[PDB]
C-alpha cells in the first residue's frame, strides 16, 4: 500500500508485522529490451523499458528531462550495519535506475554455524536473519511498485551454514545469491570436504527457487599480488563453479560468472583486460556475465575511481554483460555513503547510455594481437586444468598449493594458500549416509531412501509429512528477536527524535557527518595537520583526513576531510523566500520585435562593458533577437536621445564607466531630462550600466534600471521584456 513520491519511507511502519509477511514475487528478473526506442528527440539502440518515475541525469534538463534505462541489470551494494537506514538508501538507489540490491553480511557471518535470529547491529555489513530479510524484501516491494519495475534482492549463501541461509532465502523470496564452494575453502579456511557437500544442498535449494547464482572468482583479483597474472587461475575457478552448478541442476541462464577487469591505469588497462574479457566470453558461451568494477587497484580519489569505472564499463560494452555491478567511487576512502552509492548508479547509467549503439560502429580485431593473446590464455587455462588433474583432482591441488599463487601459470612461486584436506573449520563433521538414510523434504540433493516407506513419493519426498516449508509457508517458524538490547527497536529509540530537527548524514540516520574539501599552499604532511585545525575551528567533531593529493611538492596540497557537525537545525525556523527561461525571452522578442539604441555616453571611451551585454558570445542580447543600433563611444547625451527618436527606438541602453565626481550618475540624470523635455520619457525604456553603478541608486536618477559589476544579457533582456510589458 501507498508510498507517495513525496512522503519519506515509513521504516517504523514497515517493521510492523514481519510475521504476516510473504513475498509477492520469486526468482530472478532481467530487463525487458525496448528495441528502437524513442525518448526525447532521440532514438535508442540498446535501451530497456523506462522507469515510470525517476531522477534523470542533471544534463537531461537540456533534453526534456528524459531518463533512458540501459539493458544490463545495474547493481548497487548496500550495507552499513543497520538495515533500517539502508532501506531509505534503497529507495534512493531505485529512483536512480538501480534494479539489483546486493547486501553484504557483517564481517565473518560466514563462520556462523547456523542462522541467527532477530536484527543485531552488524560490523562492516548487515547481519543476515529472517526479520531483516523480510523487512528489506518488503520495502523493495513498495519501492518497486513505485518506480514501476521489479527489483532483485540479493545476498550471500556462504560458509558453514550454507543450506540454512539458502533455505531461508527460498522461503523468503531472495532473488539471487553468491555461492561458491571454493570461496569457502581457499579464503575462509573451511574444511574442503564439509564445504563441497554443503554446496550441493545449497545449490539444489537455489535451483528450486529459480534464483540467480553468482560465483566467487573476483576474490582472486583481491588476493593477487599482480592481478594481470592470475588469469589462468580465474578461468579455472570460474569453470569449476560453473560445471558444478550445472550438474546440480541450475540453468546456464541462471549461472553467472563474476568477472572483474584485472588491472587499472597507469597500467595499460584496456590492452590487458580486453583479451581476458574476450577469452572468458568465448570459453563460457551460454553462461551469464556479471561484470564487476575494479576495487583492488583503487585509492582515495573519487575522481580516479570514477574514471577507471568508465573504462571498466567500456570493456563490458565491447563485449557482454548481463549484470553490471557498480562500485562506490568512495570505496577506497571509507564506508560507502548514501551519495556515492547514487553516484555509482548515475555513472553506469551515464556511461552505458553514452555508448548506446556503439557496437554498431566499432568491432574487435579478433585476429591480430587480440586474437593471439586470447589463445595464450585459453592454453594456459587448459594446462592449469591438467596440472590439477595430474595431481589427483581438486582436493589434492589445493593441498599442494596451486591456488592464490602469485605467479603467471605455468610459473609457480610456491606461496599459494595451501589447505589441509583433513583440516579447516568443521573438519570431521562429514558423516557417511546410510542405506536407510531419509529426508522428507523438497530440494534434497544427496541419496535419499524414501522408498522404504512408499515408492510413489521418491520424486515428492515432502509428501511424507504433507509439505515441508517450501510448499507450506505456514510451517515456517518466525523468531522475532533473541537479544532485547542490541535490536532494531532499540536503535529506533536512539534516534526517535529526528522523525523537525535536521542534520547531515552519510550512512546512518542523523550521524552529522559532512565532507570538507580545501587546498593548502604547503607540503603534504603539514597541510594534513593544518587542515585538522581549520576543521576543528569550524566546530567539527571526530575529524579525519580522508584523502591527501599532492599538486606539487611545494606549491600545494588538496585535502578531503570528514567531520561530525555536533548540532541540529530546524526547518520551521528557516527563512525561505517564495524568473524567465532563455526560451520565453526569445519567444517574446520573437513575436513583438525590439529595437534599441546603445552607446557609451559622455567623453567615456570605455566601450567593452556595453559590447559585452550586447554581443552574442557571452549571452549578450543579440542572442535573443534584440535589434541593437550601436552609436559608438564618447556620444553626447543629446546625440543619443536624438538617435532614439530618429530610429523610433524602444529603449536607450547607455553605459558609463568612468565614475569620477559621480559623472556616471549625472550623465544618467541628463538622459532622463533630455527625454522628459522632448516628450518621450514615458514611451521609452532608459537603462544604464557601468562598473560603479548600483541598480537602486540609478533608479533614483529616473532611469528604469541600472546594472553593475557582473551583469549579463539575460538580466538585461529580462528587464527589457518585463518592463516593456508594464507600459
Amino acid at each position: 500500500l501507498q508510498l507517495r513520491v513525496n512522503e519519506k519511507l515509513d521504516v517504523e511502519n514497515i517493521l510492523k508485522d514481519l510475521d504476516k509477511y510473504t513475498p509477492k514475487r520469486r526468482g530472478w528478473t532481467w530487463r525487458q529490451p525496448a528495441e528502437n526506442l524513442q525518448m526525447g528527440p532521440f532514438i535508442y539502440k540498446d535501451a530497456s523499458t523506462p522507469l515510470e518515475n525517476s531522477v534523470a541525469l542533471p544534463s537531461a534538463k537540456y533534453f526534456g528531462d528524459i531518463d533512458p534505462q540501459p539493458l544490463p541489470v545495474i547493481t548497487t551494494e548496500i550495507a552499513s550495519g543497520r538495515f533500517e537506514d539502508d532501506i531509505r538508501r534503497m529507495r534512493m538507489a531505485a529512483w536512480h535506475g538501480a534494479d539489483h540490491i546486493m547486501v553484504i553480511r557483517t564481517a565473518g557471518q560466514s563462520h556462523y554455524d547456523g542462522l541467527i535470529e532477530g536484527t543485531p547491529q552488524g560490523i562492516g555489513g548487515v547481519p543476515i536473519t529472517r526479520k531483516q530479510v523480510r523487512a528489506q524484501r518488503k520495502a523493495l516491494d513498495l519501492i518497486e511498485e513505485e518506480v514501476g519495475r521489479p527489483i532483485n534482492y540479493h545476498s550471500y549463501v556462504s560458509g558453514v551454514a550454507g543450506p540454512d541461509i539458502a533455505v531461508m532465502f527460498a522461503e523468503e523470496g531472495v532473488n539471487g545469491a553468491h555461492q561458491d564452494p571454493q570461496y569457502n575453502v581457499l579464503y575462509r579456511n573451511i574444511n574442503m570436504i564439509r564445504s563441497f557437500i554443503d554446496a550441493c544442498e545449497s545449490k539444489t535449494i537455489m535451483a528450486w527457487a529459480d534464483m540467480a547464482q553468482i560465483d566467487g572468482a573476483h576474490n582472486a583479483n583481491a588476493t593477487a599480488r599482480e592481478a594481470w597474472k592470475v588469469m589462468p587461475e580465474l578461468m579455472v575457478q570460474h569453470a569449476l563453479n560453473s560445471i558444478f552448478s550445472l550438474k546440480v541442476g541450475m540453468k546456464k541462464s541462471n549461472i553467472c560468472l563474476s568477472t572483474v577487469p584485472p588491472t587499472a591505469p597507469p597500467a595499460p588497462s584496456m590492452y590487458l583486460d580486453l583479451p581476458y574479457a574476450v577469452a572468458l566470453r568465448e570459453m563460457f558461451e551460454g553462461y551469464r556475465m556479471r561484470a564487476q568494477m575494479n576495487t583492488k587497484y583503487m585509492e582515495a580519489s573519487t575522481r580516479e575511481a570514477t574514471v577507471t569505472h568508465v573504462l571498466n564499463l567500456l570493456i563490458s560494452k565491447l563485449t557482454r554483460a548481463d549484470i553490471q555491478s557498480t562500485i562506490t567511487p568512495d570505496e577506497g576512502r571509507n564506508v560507502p555513503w548514501h551519495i556515492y552509492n547514487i553516484e555509482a548508479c548515475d555513472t553506469a547509467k551515464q556511461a552505458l547510455i553514452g555508448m548506446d549503439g556503439l557496437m554498431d560502429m566499432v568491432q574487435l580485431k579478433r585476429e591480430g594481437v587480440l586474437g593471439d593473446t586470447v589463445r595464450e590464455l585459453k592454453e594456459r587455462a587448459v594446462l592449469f586444468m591438467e596440472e590439477i588433474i595430474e595431481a589427483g583432482g581438486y582436493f589434492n591441488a589445493v593441498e599442494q598449493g596451486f591456488f592464490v599463487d602469485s605467479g603467471y601459470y605455468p610459473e609457480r612461486n610456491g606461496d599459494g594458500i595451501a589447505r589441509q584436506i583433513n583440516g579447516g573449520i568443521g573438519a570431521g563433521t562429514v558423516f557417511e549416509r546410510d542405506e536407510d538414510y531419509m529426508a522428507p523434504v523438497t530440494a534434497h540433493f544427496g541419496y535419499n531412501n524414501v522408498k522404504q516407506y512408499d515408492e510413489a513419493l521418491v520424486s515428492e519426498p515432502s509428501k511424507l509429512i504433507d509439505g515441508c516449508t517450501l510448499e507450506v509457508p505456514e510451517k515456517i517458524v518466525y523468531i522475532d528477536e533473541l537479544d532485547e538490547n542490541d535490536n532494531v527497536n532499540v536503535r529506533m529509540e536512539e534516534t526517535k527524535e529526528f522523525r523537525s530537527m535536521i542534520k547531515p548524514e552519510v550512512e546512518w540516520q542523523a550521524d552529522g557527518t559532512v565532507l570538507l574539501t580545501m587546498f593548502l599552499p604547503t607540503s603534504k604532511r603539514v597541510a594534513e595537520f593544518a587542515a585538522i585545525e581549520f576543521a576543528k575551528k569550524m566546530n567539527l567533531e571526530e575529524v579525519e583526513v580522508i584523502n591527501r593529493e599532492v599538486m606539487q611538492e611545494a606549491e600545494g596540497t588538496r585535502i578531503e576531510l570528514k567531520g561530525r557537525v555536533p548540532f541540529s537545525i530546524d526547518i520551521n525556523s528557516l527563512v525561505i523566500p517564495p524568473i524567465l527561461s532563455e526560451d520565453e525571452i526569445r519567444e517574446d522578442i520573437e513575436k513583438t520585435p525590439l529595437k534599441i539604441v546603445a552607446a557609451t555616453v559622455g567623453e567615456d571611451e570605455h566601450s567593452v562593458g556595453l559590447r559585452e551585454v550586447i554581443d552574442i558570445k557571452h549571452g549578450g542580447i543579440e542572442k535573443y533577437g534584440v535589434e541593437v543600433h550601436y552609436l559608438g563611444t564618447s556620444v553626447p547625451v543629446e546625440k543619443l536621445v536624438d538617435a532614439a527618436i530618429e530610429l523610433k527606438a524602444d529603449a536607450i541602453l547607455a553605459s558609463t564607466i568612468i565614475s569620477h565626481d559621480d559623472i556616471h550618475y549625472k550623465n544618467m540624470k541628463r538622459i532622463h531630462e533630455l527625454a522628459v523635455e522632448k516628450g518621450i520619457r514615458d514611451k521609452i525604456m532608459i537603462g544604464c550600466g557601468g562598473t560603479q553603478v548600483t541598480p537602486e541608486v540609478a533608479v533614483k536618477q529616473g532611469v528604469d534600471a541600472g546594472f553593475g559589476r557582473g551583469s549579463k544579457g539575460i538580466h538585461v533582456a529580462t528587464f527589457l521584456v518585463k518592463k516593456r510589458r508594464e507600459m
Binding site: 554455524d113 547456523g114 542462522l115 535470529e117 558453514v160 551454514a161 543450506p163 540454512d164 539458502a166 533455505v167 570436504i193 557437500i197 554443503d198 550441493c200 544442498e201 569453470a239 569449476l240 560453473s242 560445471i243 550438474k247 568465448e282 585459453k378 592454453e379 594456459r380 587448459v382 594446462l383 586444468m385 590439477i388 588433474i389 583432482g393 581438486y394 605455468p410 610459473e411 568443521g426 563433521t429 562429514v430 558423516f431 557417511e432 549416509r433 546410510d434 536407510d436 538414510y437 531419509m438 529426508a439 522428507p440 523434504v441 530440494a443 534434497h444 544427496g446 541419496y447 515432502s462 509429512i465 515441508c468 516449508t469 517450501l470 507450506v472 510451517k475 515456517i476 517458524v477 523468531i479
Partner: protein, 109 residues
C-alpha cells in the same frame, strides 16, 4: 618453460581446446558431486529440519544430539519422523521432544 608445456595443445583447433577445457572441468568435479551424494553434514541436517518446520534453534538441538548418538547416518529428519510414527504423535512434537533428551532410547532401536 611455458613454451614447451604448450606444445601438445598447439595443434588443437580453438574449439577442440574449448572441448578439452570443459571435459577436464567435468572430470575435476564429478568426484566432488559424489562425495555430495553419499555423505551428510551438520548444516545439511539442520536445513532438513528447517524445512520440516523447526526453528534454527530447535534444529541445532536435534542435530547436536543426533551427532552424540552416532545417528547422523540415518538422517536427523528420519529420526524425527520414525519417532513420530512410533509413538504416533506429530512431527513438531516428536521433534520438539527430541530437543531435550526425550525419545532417544526408543530412537536407538
Amino acid at each position: 618453460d611455458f613454451q614447451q608445456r604448450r606444445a601438445h595443445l598447439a595443434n588443437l583447433s580453438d574449439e577442440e581446446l574449448q572441448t578439452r577445457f570443459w571435459e577436464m572441468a567435468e572430470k575435476i568435479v564429478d568426484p566432488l558431486l559424489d562425495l555430495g551424494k553419499k555423505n551428510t553434514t551438520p548444516s545439511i541436517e539442520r536445513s532438513v529440519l528447517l524445512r520440516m518446520g523447526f526453528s534454527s534453534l530447535e534444529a541445532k538441538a536435534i542435530v547436536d544430539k543426533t551427532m552424540d548418538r552416532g545417528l547422523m547416518g540415518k538422517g536427523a529428519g528420519h529420526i524425527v519422523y520414525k519417532i513420530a510414527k512410533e509413538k504416533n504423535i506429530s512431527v513438531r512434537e516428536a521433534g520438539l521432544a527430541l530437543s531435550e533428551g526425550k525419545y532417544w532410547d526408543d530412537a536407538i532401536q
